[PDB]
Write a protein that binds this ligand. Structure first.
Ligand SMILES: Nc1nc2c(ncn2[C@@H]2O[C@H](COP(=O)(O)OP(=O)(O)OP(=O)(O)O)[C@@H](O)[C@H]2O)c(=O)[nH]1
Ligand SMILES: Nc1nc2c(ncn2[C@@H]2O[C@H](COP(=O)(O)OP(=O)(O)OP(=O)(O)O)[C@@H](O)[C@H]2O)c(=O)[nH]1
Ligand SMILES: [Mg+2]
Ligand SMILES: [Mg+2]
Lengths: 548, 548
């Protein structure tokens, strides 16, 4: 028929190598990308078997009909025995007549070409890969421009910071895949709610940035409260399970030519934080005095609260085990230390009820110094018993305020001399987020501590070319997979794949891998098969009191 | 016909959204990816015009028939007026009957899906994006494994470092595109030359790594000299123009369980460097004494050579102008300082004849201290004339040895007090390579110097998600496009695109862009249209004597 002409132009427009072959291997179709990949033209390869022209090997075939579908991409090579190797990502699907398997369709994507996608790189550098919206880079650029521009700067602009409430709930409850969907759904609503000219970005985490150029004060607040309402009305559900999605909005009225970029960003931050501190699901319009006096008050309140607790011995330490998944590995006892705070009545205070405030008001060095001192102190008390399970690894999480703290090493040195805890026994922890936020200091800190003889771990680790590049510079011993990826590993094929990639590249880069949120033995066995070195979760052991 | 069944399964296996429409817009085909992208099924969209179902807008159509082909990818959005926006990279080709334009074929790739390609990320993290071979990460991993492995460690291994000779020649002569082809061609020969089990990687630049596990000493050297010969016999040509490709090989015989990874890498480096220092196109087998005594001798030779030159006033400084491309921009005179060395006879010494040796033997701090001192000294002498063209920017290149030098800032402070040159007038330069090689120190150095009031530039800048991520951490004022990209900008569509992306993302990140190797006004006008802030090259001004 004349359909061949239509299909051939479509098949030739596709940049990916398309190969169609009969059930027995004989070639039926090769598009120009397949021809260039295999070094064989269709006219010289038609009817001839696949294996006799080129090889689709691995790194040292009929499986497609069985189980190796086109759902997932498979890393193969194209060994052509002339011009040799071409690295691909294969996808295969059977060809049917109607319950009669007649052939095979192969979609082959050339890994060498990825470097040539200039529009893709450019897009990526200015947009969030998940949500599709502009990123922090592009947003801050557009915000700066709105203020510095010579033209079209007649009226005032409106900066908004919209942060999702209890977004960690969604991730720790269902997993990372669920949280990504919610983010994508939150994205579509804020898209529908804004007009052309308005700039909407994901600034990181569950935080979005909205810019309304040349829009009045009353109009600006009206839009914010409406967007707040539309997210409140979002009936988000994950595999039946419904979630109450809510947002905390921080609004700032801007002036082009007067108000600086860093002043604008910081003002929207205090207002967003204040809407949270004021109970969540609220819009907090920044006022230079009215919404600033509460920051001075909040600092005073928390200085008193953190110091009282410390003085009143209400902070305590818990220990959760980390165990080797490797068959034959014994080692010393590995525990991760976790902080707990009890109020004046004597009941446990949730983490979000004081860590965000202590972090905001620079009270984290205090707590980290108390944690480290009382961990070493406990280890001495625990050692008084000879029968006691000796701790080979005691992991402690440090904040960004500590990573940057010049006086921490002298304090740690002093602590070592006082409690005689071997440095080797201690494993300091920093999140991927905290490390990158203070990159030059993190590198400097990790190396100084490693010289002392301490180990280091990188927490809440995501996979990407960025995170793996940051990993080259961060000399940590362990890599800890974010729990959200482990939570639905066995239910979501991308989260399972994420775990596998974090593991492989983590092993490639000389790191030992740890999986958190291993709540069942099914998850434990899955991680063991993959190759994960350590497991932590409710299937391993629950957090138990450590300190007295 | 029954061809529809064959084509539909192929079209459904493609992950990219395929849209086929008539010349007048009416839809003919949508694959499941196109249906999911546009929110419209083919059964409910067949015959109906494109524009009336969804919109393929931009960020604020018939052009395809004219000029906007499927050769280059175009960044568009898919505004569907229901579930709103989907960010794509469009490619379009006309549909013919035979010189009769009947319709249009659109290949739409969803930018949101890029995050889900796990096999692609994993491949990327373990392989060079250009050459397709394993990267430094994977190679060092495999090398470590060869040494640390409990099993299959019977015999000895062979580490090889193959570095292309005068590879900068190919790039500065033809451009980056030519050099990439040569690298890809060098890759295919080393592929054909090695057997299954042998590990071949691009370790960076024009340097390749080869590992021959459980291969005798005599066999190991035999393979190296053969590979050296096959590259010598490579008749490389770029658009008619032939190039004599040659390689300098450094070989090390390894022992699993004794010889460490860093000892192995360093030994292959000294042997490769020695084959270069010994005249290039040679294989230098590392010998612990015989090929180590020459490193002590070479250090002695160069300490004497660099100090003599300094003592004998044979080092001089040249100045090359940098000019604004922006229409209306005047500014002060911008010059880039370049070092030159004259031998004992009085004739100019090529850069490769002393900078590789001075860099190898730690003599770069010396030269950088002489350059900076004599630049400030010249600026005072030049200022004695009131008529003199005042220099608003004087750019000086600093080495990795300087970026890491703790005593440089006190020396610079002293120089400032002695020659009273305004810090603002000085622009320090570091290559992307040097910055990343010493990342924590570069960041620390750039910020300390910026506080003094100096400007900073990032040289030989490549584009990628890695380089743009490194750029977030490096607070430089200017970004300098690598000349190799500018050389064939007007002849190669990818190098033109590279220039455009380096520019856009450089402007996004608050940097001012500079293009080097602007040898013609055609290149100058091209860069001006793109948006480049500054131009440097033989169309602007040639390097002229600066120092006396
Ligand atoms: N699924 C997913 N989760 C992410 C992503 N980026 C960050 N997160 C998670 O988002 C959460 C952000 O937590 P927070 O905003 O600090 O805390 P919260 O639970 O929302 O509580 P509030 O203080 O009320 O904001 C963490 O659990 C992160 O691991 C992403 O791209 N995808
Ligand atoms: N086209 C291209 N050029 C690259 C790439 N990576 C690095 N280069 C260039 O490769 C060159 C490496 O130069 P060198 O090896 O130090 O110098 P050389 O000219 O080969 O001289 P020798 O000292 O004999 O090795 C520089 O011009 C780099 O800019 C790449 O991926 N593609
Ligand atoms: Mg939140
Ligand atoms: Mg070279």
């Amino acid at each position: 028929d004349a359909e061949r002409e239509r299909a051939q132009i479509t098949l030739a427009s596709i940049g990916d190598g398309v190969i169609t072959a009969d059930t027995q291997g004989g070639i039926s179709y090769l598009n120009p990308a397949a021809e260039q990949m295999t070094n064989w033209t269709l006219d010289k390869a038609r009817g001839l078997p696949l294996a006799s022209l080129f090889r689709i090997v691995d790194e040292s075939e009929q499986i497609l009909s069985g189980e190796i579908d086109g759902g997932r991409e498979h890393s193969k090579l194209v060994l052509r025995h002339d011009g040799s190797s071409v690295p691909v990502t294969l996808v295969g699907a059977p060809i049917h007549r109607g319950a009669e398997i007649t052939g095979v369709v192969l979609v082959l994507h050339d890994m060498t070409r990825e470097r040539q996608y200039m529009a893709r790189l450019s897009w990526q550098a200015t947009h969030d890969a998940l949500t599709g919206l502009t990123n922090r880079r592009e947003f801050e650029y557009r915000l700066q421009i709105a203020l510095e521009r010579l033209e079209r700067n007649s009226g005032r602009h409106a900066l908004m910071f919209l942060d999702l409430d209890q977004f960690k709930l969604v991730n720790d409850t269902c997993g990372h895949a669920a949280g990504d969907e919610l983010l994508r759904q939150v994205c579509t609503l804020l898209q529908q709610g804004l007009r052309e000219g308005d700039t909407l970005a994901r600034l990181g985490g569950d935080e979005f940035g909205i810019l309304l150029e040349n829009c009045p004060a009353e109009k600006a607040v009206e839009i914010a409260d409406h967007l707040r309402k539309t997210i409140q009305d979002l009936h988000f559900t994950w595999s039946g399970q419904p979630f109450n999605c809510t947002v905390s909005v921080g609004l700032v009225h801007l002036l082009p030519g007067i108000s600086t970029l860093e002043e604008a960003l910081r003002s929207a931050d205090m207002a967003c934080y204040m809407a949270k501190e004021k109970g969540r699901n609220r819009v907090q319009v920044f006022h230079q005095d009215d919404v600033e006096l509460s920051m001075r008050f909040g600092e005073m309140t928390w200085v008193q609260r953190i110091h009282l607790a410390l003085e009143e011995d209400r902070f305590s330490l818990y220990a959760q085990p980390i165990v080797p998944l490797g068959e034959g590995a014994e080692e010393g006892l590995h525990v991760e230390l976790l902080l707990r705070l009890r109020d004046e009545g004597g009941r446990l205070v949730p983490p979000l009820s004081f860590i965000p405030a202590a972090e905001r008001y620079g009270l984290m060095t205090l707590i980290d110094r108390w944690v480290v001192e009382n961990a070493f102190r406990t280890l001495v008390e625990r050692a008084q018993d000879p029968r006691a399970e000796p701790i080979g690894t005691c992991a402690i999480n440090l904040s960004g305020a500590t990573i940057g703290d010049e006086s921490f090493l002298q304090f740690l040195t002093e602590l070592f001399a006082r409690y005689r805890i071997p440095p080797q026994t201690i494993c300091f922890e920093v999140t991927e987020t905290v490390a990158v936020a203070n990159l030059a200091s993190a590198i400097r800190f990790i190396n100084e501590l490693k010289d002392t003889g301490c180990r280091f771990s990188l927490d809440d680790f995501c996979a990407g070319m960025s995170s793996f590049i940051y990993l080259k510079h961060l000399p940590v011993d362990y890599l800890k997979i974010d729990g959200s990826f482990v939570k639905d590993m066995l239910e979501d094929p991308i989260d399972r794949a994420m775990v596998q990639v974090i593991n492989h590249i983590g092993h490639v880069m000389g790191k030992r891998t740890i999986a958190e949120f291993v709540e069942t033995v099914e998850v434990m066995e899955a991680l063991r098969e993959i190759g994960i070195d350590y497991a932590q979760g409710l299937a391993i052991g629950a957090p138990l009191p450590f300190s007295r």
